[model samples]
Target: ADVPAGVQLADKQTLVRNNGSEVQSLDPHKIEGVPESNVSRDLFEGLLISDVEGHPSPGVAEKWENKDFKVWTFHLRENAKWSDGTPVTAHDFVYSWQRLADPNTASPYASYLQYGHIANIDDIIAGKKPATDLGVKALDDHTFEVTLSEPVPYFYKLLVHPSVSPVPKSAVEKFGDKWTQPANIVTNGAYKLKNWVVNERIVLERNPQYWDNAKTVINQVTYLPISSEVTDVNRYRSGEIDMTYNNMPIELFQKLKKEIPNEVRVDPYLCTYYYEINNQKAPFNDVRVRTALKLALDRDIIVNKVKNQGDLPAYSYTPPYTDGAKLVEPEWFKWSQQKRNEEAKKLLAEAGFTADKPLTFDLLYNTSDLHKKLAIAVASIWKKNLGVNVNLENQEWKTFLDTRHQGTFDVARAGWCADYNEPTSFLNTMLSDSSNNTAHYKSPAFDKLIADTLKVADDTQRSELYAKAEQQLDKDSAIVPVYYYVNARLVKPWVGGYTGKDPLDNIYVKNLYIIKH
Candidate 1:
């Protein structure tokens, strides 16, 4: 059914999307949040992308292959062009990859490229070598070649990451940090930035120069940042938008499921919802304090009572979507809830806490009714069971991410949505040198395990090594895994193309258009 047969839109070929979270940055290389990625995806295209089957599909590079497992070649399309009408070249990718690997650029996901089989990636990040020495090279205007130091079974999937998305050197060299602004930006994706009204809305217009512009359906897409659940529900019901990306309240999940079954979308997402503890301080720096806090909470209550979705209680950070997750979890993680709470008190006592000198700490979370409720539930559980005082603080989405990124919080709510479908996506965040290691955890043993896991070409042996790294993370209590995620979305019945099960949830506007009756 159309959105009220008589109601006319500003433009019938427009797809208005509502999201409950603010985008942190539009710079493709610096994008960390899902919202930022959502925008970045429309603005740039990497060499490859994952299809609905979770297999590597073509993006900018129409086709690619590996000749010797260590060397891969990519063939660019003849018609790909930047929004400015410049031809997209293989050299653009080389520039973007080298820029991301350069430590001076300070890309958060820079550490991820080491697993991409790029030779000398480590030396480039360490400032011992320049980007030209990296494994990737432009064979010609239409061909790109990459030489890996070792073999990687899933290297094609890694190419889909936004960090490797090609950029226009002309824009960056001219505008520097301001290059992402609508006027200064140049892109090669299906859409180009039209306007950005901070804290309000972002507009994207179809890229006339897109290689596959003939296949694009939607001419424009407007993104509204509406983080309030009540607001999002109201907007969707009023027919003001075509899609609601987040902030589906716990109460509405069931109501929408029954009333508007076609509009409601629920799918298992490859994500882990967790809390990160700042491990650099005196209190959390102590392992007993971290473990005591980890044990005190009832994950079952969070998943069943608080969330009440199909979300699974997470005993370990790695979810079932990743390879070899069965062996990655430890036996001790299977202890019953009662056993965990009982052990929590003893550990708290060992850490010098009593009913009188009870442990006290503040919990930080982003602004949202759901986040607030989860924090309150955890605080109540800890206060009742462990006899500790837990204070709660909340901030807006962007501010919360900035504060957490700076390591200014005692304990904070955090989550990981897989960048690519791999166990390393979860494990790499805790690497000692990873900029995204927001908790400031440092463990050489965990780092070595990850490095070894990347070197092994055998899928089974690699997964076994991955399990050991996950076990080490659990042993250190690196982070608290509360519940795995289920993607709850309210996509209009007319929105034909969307990916419900893909971990990235990459919904492209070019593939969507208003259905005409």
Candidate 2:
């Protein structure tokens, strides 16, 4: 077939995108944030990959089957090869999974496989068992087997996470921590790391050895670590990039949408922006204090006036789009702002705070103009409505993450995008043992509900369990759900196959093409 007229291709099929921030690490196990995952996804392929529409699809594993949702087997593609031209094998997966479960690795996402109910993963992560004791086995060179502690209906979806992506064991053993360096890295994905200049830019070139390289279109992808949404828009306007990150200046949203209707892409994203309350702390440990703080906020103003984007006010941790689960909103959600304020004041009084002795704590957020704005607005609301004094604090992303993980912050700005489509993705974080439970929330009832979901085979029963779990979260009020995310960004008109369909926003350059203007 000949190239169609007026649909000419660009001379250089290169895609440059705003990655929002400097990635912490290229090692899939070590990386924690979206920026890191954005770059890591391009450099590695898991057994299962998310399709353009964000459903689980085959990657290195050509096919997979589950025996009663407990024992799963994956058949690797014979032609799958690493960037170094070595055949990718099931052994690579076993090794990678073990490494991820190894407590010595200290992966922030170490609980991911445990969430999938992988047998012995909990013990391995708790240092009671060896990583090799985890139930993943290489049955053969191309066949991988996994035994689950319980029936996990969403096991396939969990494999799409980058944390489970196979790493080259030989390369890791040789280079140790330097294995992810551009020159030493060996990737199984369609692209290989060409260069990474830290905060400046990371570049990837198409890998010739990729099993599906014949179908890959874009030749090169560049990720720019542009932190500011305002600067991201400026760069996009200057035509220095093909796509903006999931956020742009909220004030410019309407103007950009009106000026470039076709290029401005906004879609529902499966993420929840919230504040992680320090449940282990003094005042916040009281349910009345936690609930009072949660109820005092006017999320409508935060979403509409402050954000100015078409984002929805969130009262639940899990987005409404989560598969098969019904959102259980708190009773206070039905109250008017005035009524909520009245109840909040009453709760605060009951918790022993008054005009003379006000409740005070630090409201922590990462360094970003947007985050600062939101924090200021929230603090003002608390002060105005409930006579609370909130001290605003900001830190760099890495330090902020560490501080939150160590429970050193009063209330910290946090957001969670689903690792899978299931409600458990968000609910599981409240588990006492969850690595991501920065709030240090310990609710036996909530944990049991989430754990019970895995034991039931019926989807409806699982959904019911999830709803109960969400209600439990609302009752505890350990976190404040601010808003559900809307992925607002700019995509150049010439960027073909840039579908904004993935709720998780897992964009893949291999499926994209560059068309001439």
Candidate 3:
């Protein structure tokens, strides 16, 4: 609405909500990465939005039909509009999809849209066919249709996602080089981007023209990029902010739990903090070294002294609360501590480490006090248990991400938070060609399991296969299981209706209304 027709596009860096409740989304055409993608999810409306249990419900397109097994028709909402008065039409959708698969755009996540079902989408995006020659076509201003390459059970759920929704032709043409910039964007959902300043703050105001504006509950909502623990806690206490992003200090978590216990709430987050040893790198190449190093650490001490609260000890790569599927803690943690230590010594001795010579490696992590504490605790354990010394270093998240994904680190802090309840989203994203997999971990058996499970019809058989795949993941020691993440959000009483969750826990902020003061 704020933009004109015809403009080239430029996108934002990334801004994941402090809590996972907000999804990462930006263009309804390409959504890559988590938390931040969920954050952008509110900006664009799609065919469906998910309910809490991860079921798709209607959003922009009210209903759709499969006239034939291979042909699908979608009818868009007549009431939907861009920030301005322009109606969100079918042409916008056709354009949006073309842009995603267009080889010229070169979106890293373009493959996600293919799902091997959107007819000729891959070929078109890969320059095999003209955009106008593809399967998707706008029938009129309010209707659209497509021919599927195959039947996809989850196709509807994926459509409501940002990667499949329509992008206004007017906004794209007018914004030119500044499409997502503060001065160049238009919003169609429940809120409009009022302001955005990286690592400083971001604000959103209610969308007066939303299709269901009257039913919308929030008047105005805001998300902050507060990274410092002290600053986040102080702002929450002084009422300068509505909540503290879950990075609170252990000292503070204990103090607050003692004083204002109700203000602090901890729930099991579907996040697992682990470390990936670049298989392509040296030292980590030896499976014996990898297995030995992991066994030497005393997780009980690390959790007790290093992590204050909201943390379950890491005994395996997969967290216990991973949708009720968890392997028993690794043998090292389950066995006698002394015996595990002895076993680590024998394994390390075989891997060329002896009592006379300690194995040494560079350990890297994200810059934060938690990393320092955890590193120091584990380093101490290594020195005492297996006669090894670890050199520790930490850096900012962006720097850490680039280095890890590029395979520059010997050992790095790796955290995976569940995208939905699907094991595929978790296991596949980092392990396969999917996004966020930086460790370069691979197994042919595991890969085939993922491929087969997605198309399985029997729920019992699929669940069984998923279990075996997770066990194989453990055998590789691809990641050193650390702890189950417990997410705690410190909020002020005035902030009502906001559903608080951890780093990838997707929830709707549409009804999160602040008390009108």
Candidate 4:
């Protein structure tokens, strides 16, 4: 006998997604990477959350206002409750933000609150002050207050990042380091952790205690940490997943898009893929050699021929979609590839490198088929275009992060997605004191321009400052701007409300539902 349509459709409400890799941690303050963010957003509620189009929407906080963009106050909704049946209070946010800036926590995104100009965050991170002395405070049960060291124009958008999301202080104190385990976790988002099997799967079920649980359509969400792009695509095709991660096999993108036109999503993503050249290392320390390498890269071929995805060749570090910023291209960007190659050769020669003594360096990348392919192509390009001896090195993701962070590599693969939709999101990473400055780029002039942005209230004036900052980066040859990314993935037809419109590509499960096939 045939199954009833209603009963069959009821079983389809679970959303199985390919999460790319094993999540680093479930602690909102400690996690970094797209995979971790994917789970974190579903498990924790911040003051604000990204809507379908990536606009700031009220989450735990029902409303917020700022005075001169420095003194901010948030009014939390009374209905918001944690999975363990406790109210998510304003003190939770105050504690979470302080923990993020606390040096003892050692969160990778510890500088996030500092970048937002939160008062006392810098001192707290430097151990000059205690976390309790940080600027945020709880006025009462539902009112949160924040004071910034300076005016921050894009501070509202920054609150959506997981690093600043509210956490239960009671749970953290009770469970200690094991607070993130499925059994001990207390989530305030639309979903709560059901089970987590390392390297295999993480399962979450609908949180009845969630403030908006009545509106959440998906009953359960499953994330599989399938690292291989080819494997992700295969699983997607075999009816095992409703959505694939941001990347699919580059060679297979065209084929898959052609075969399943509606399911394959290719949207302009707010990210830039580039190479971080060690400015503290030999040869790379020379600006001429750095510029020569940057000029020799054929970004067009990398995006069009090698990647074959709908990505744009990047001539600037910041994407055009960044709010309140103008795209600034390098002077040599308009030059023909032939002219650029000629210029590259001249610069290399001027830097005392030639056929007899070619500049040699190792290109380091994390273990991924795409990274390996790109490394091979770029190494080949440098060898042919500039007559440089380039070696390739690959390591696992965690080890590669450590190697790059410690400045152990000559040139390493790097990519940045906007923490918020602002120019500073991309530019701030190059600051002299930036923890994310893996390239070790230090320029007083560049740092000053970035610092000056906080003082300007006028959008046009701020944009001009951002342009000057980009120009300084171009002059310094800080990093090779290779390509701006496009989010390419496969989504099943039954998945409703899966709009890939967010430049940040922050997909919230609360907005998704399963449609009857």
Candidate 5:
């Protein structure tokens, strides 16, 4: 069903596959979020499962052994099979990696695994050499080996994602352009998609060809469409749904908690939903103009007025609970107006703008009540602070995304969430280079810091490096750090066996369970 324009559904009994593709095709390579064509990573499987916690336990590859710092080998489960009833072999993994690295493809994530993590992928992708020479190679049908760009300690967990789904050579060649979709798709994971409706719902069912098909507890799943708060709460309470997401209004959350604590579960999502200013363009290109516009936002108003379910006032885009990494988060909330006012003044003066020489700009966001409230709130802040006229532009989500991703907006609201519980999920995409750099902003130091850290073997050392990069990211003002997000779903108590790390955890249906009465 269509998401009812703006009405929420009451289907908590089913996990709705959020139709993530801006376009069509379930091709794993086209994945960006659903980029793996594996929303929730259902249609894909990796050597290990990393989302369980910090450590990656074995998944498709039952057990693996590292021969040395540079060479590693893997052992696949004897029974694992593709959806087509073919054995999932090391050859499949080899082909899949090759497919991702193929120069002809448009996968942004192809370079992610090798981001200073894998050996020679950077040069290979840049046309310095061929993908065959780039490190990972198959020894035989079952055994595989990988060399690294550096001594990668976390490489084990990197496989627990669709980005690393083993692709059979036959599957890719047979399907080719058709490789990404419903009919021609192959699977090594728990489930495969049945149907996908853009801006609507998606469906999934257990992979009958799966090696552990019998161990798969949930037999069939449906990703129903959900949209509003009023209907979301009503449908959930009626038990017509197993799980429904997005969030409820604050008054709604408070009311539900008082009457139905058993039905509500709050999961701290690993995301920071905030605003971003277009740094590569002018107007906002002026530091004073950016600060003047950003300072206008009153985040508390958002948490209280629009989103109520404990979505904290986010100050850092790198959420606080993402693995409890040690880093100093910027404190935007604790600042008094006097301090903020002083800061804005300093920035404006530095940019040669004052009340007499006021900076000018516009703020853009998706056209929704939630965003309008944010846009208007920021407009008010800028108007009061620097006497600058801040025009607010709102567009439909589709229109907004097309313009934003193409670098067509001035001041825009944006955010990032941890895909598989890693800082790289946030930083790697947004900071790397002009390729994944959505804002079209870059700095030599920022790039070097991230690239330099990827080679660090020690987790503690890597943590410090990423932290310094994040702080430096703050100074660059490429993005305005906002409050971290906390996601909550009003799930019923009977929805048992739901053991995830956080409440607003973004783990989709393939990772969840349901008990039928």
Candidate 6:
């Protein structure tokens, strides 16, 4: 087979990928954005990683075993070495996991500890016990053991999350927070950071010290930080890049599909794009106001017209795909679009807001053309339907995240990609104590439902409770679901052994190669 139209492998062994946004932080623990996940996944190896099909595969830990269901043991590959030629040991996992569960770390993902998955992690994170008291242990230099408080059925699946990847303590102890710099960093993955020019681009070279260095065929991977889809699509057309990852415009994607269908890929992705109403401040604190905002938007229009992608209008906060029994949505979602809009106006009127005394607030989103369009559409919907005045505010990704964390916005754009293929991956974020609960909305009934669901070991029974919990969440209108995401990517036909179909979209470049005919 000859290379498809407009395809050329520039130096065949070098693969260039565009990560649409600049990587905010390379440190795995601090990453909140999906673009950062691309960098972290390639540079830092976790105990396990998801294959192209989204199944857990061996990584730093060659294999993991569970004897009593509460205790899990992982055997590290002795041949694995950090980029600096230092042996990768079980202690690295112990250190990384402890830091993740430590309060001093202040990782927004620290909610993983409070869930009581790892035994006694609550005491460790609360400062009641030392970090050493955390459930993870190192037996000699190769065996990592983790003890859990309760049986988490999907425990192995959780290991693929970027948060579980090991970080080099030696480099961190020496360089402090600057350890991520190209000069100071050491990683155990297939590639090592060679150059990072901030918002310009990042360069990764094959790690000579990798355990399977001979098989890590890609000599170099260049990650270009793209601000414009126009430039990225042009580059791919001219053979400047082998792949483009996220945020490709759907309209352009349609054109590309018609022109060169073999180069484009679209697959169902597990993500929910939503807007989080700031419940910590007024006037969103009034449940009626929150409910009014949710009811005002026509999600179908946004997904079908503005997006033009095959994304489903999200009627539920949780994306449709999960490993458990089927999740049912609330009954209220069955109402017609016109009916929802009418109810929106009534709620606004009841909240002391009319065209005269209109409710005014800001809709915050990160600076992306797609996000900007969605923001304008949603704002217009509120203004048109409920006589509300919504001012749109856009900020760069880092600033936007910080603003949302400080609860300084009336409403903010947010999305969640499942860390694991379970309902808990989505539902757990709404818990009162979860660090990822940016909305600050609290409900006793919702919390109790999550708590109760966690205790139920049966899958079908737990899914029933999840439906009830999601229904209560909808009633509160903590966040308005916009749409479920679809992964639309451009891959040169010459690129083989790469599949971005999974919901996680985690691609291992070591398996990617240029097939020349």
> lDDT: which candidate is best?
2
The residue-by-residue lDDT of candidate 1 on 1-517, one tens digit each, is: 1234464433468788986677887887777787887788788988986564456678889989997677999999988899999999899988988888888888877876776758998888889998778899999998989889887766787887778889888899999999989989999999999999988999999999998788787888999888777577778889987888765676567678788988888876888888899998778998888887888888878889877878888877778676555555555458887788789889889988887788998899987767888899999988887788989998888888788778888999888888778887778888887867898999999999988975766778888877788778788988888888888888887676575756567666666667642
Worst 10 residues of 4 by lDDT: 1-10
Instruction: Give a tens-digit lDDT track for model 5, residues 1-517.
Output: 1121333333343553322223334565555442223354566776765443334666778888875455668888878888888888887777777767766775656766564256777776787877777677778777778777566555675575555767656767887876656777777777876776665556777888876565455556655444344555666667665655544544366787789877676666777867777778976666565664455455665555555557777655577666635677666447875677777667777877767777666678754444565567667766776566667887655566667668887778775666556666666765645345666677778777777765666778878877887777666666765567665666665454444464224243444544444
**What is the clash count of model 5?**
31
lDDT of 6 by residue, 380-461 (tens): 8777777888789988777887888788989998888888777778888888878788888888999999888757778778
Candidate 6: clashing pairs of residues: none
**Residue ranges of candidate 1 with Cα displaced over 4 Å:** 1-11, 52-54, 328-333
Q: In order, what is each prediction's RMSD in angstroms?
A: 3.1, 1.8, 7.1, 3.1, 5.7, 2.8
TM-score of each: 0.94, 0.97, 0.82, 0.95, 0.84, 0.95
Which residue pairs show backbone clashes in model 1?
A: none
List the global CA lDDT of all models. Answer: 0.81, 0.88, 0.65, 0.86, 0.63, 0.82
* Poorest stretch of ten by lDDT in candidate 6: 1-10
Q: Per-residue lDDT tens digits of candidate 2, residues 309-422?
A: 888988998887778768777779988989989998999999888778989999998777678888989999988988999999988776788898898989888999998998
Q: What are the per-residue Cα lDDT tens digits for candidate 3 across 190-244? A: 6777777765556676678888677555555567655456556767777666666
Ranked by TM-score, top first: 2, 4, 6, 1, 5, 3
- Once fitted onto the true fold, the runs of candidate 2 whose alpha carbons sit more than 4 angstroms away are 1-6
Location of the lowest summed lDDT over 10 successive residues in candidate 5: 1-10
Ranking by lDDT, best first? 2, 4, 6, 1, 3, 5
Considering every candidate listed, which one attains the maximal TM-score? 2
Give candidate 6's TM-score.
0.95
Residue 392 lDDT (model 3): 94
Residue-pair clashes, model 2: 0
Q: Which model is ahead, 1 or 3, in terms of TM-score?
A: 1
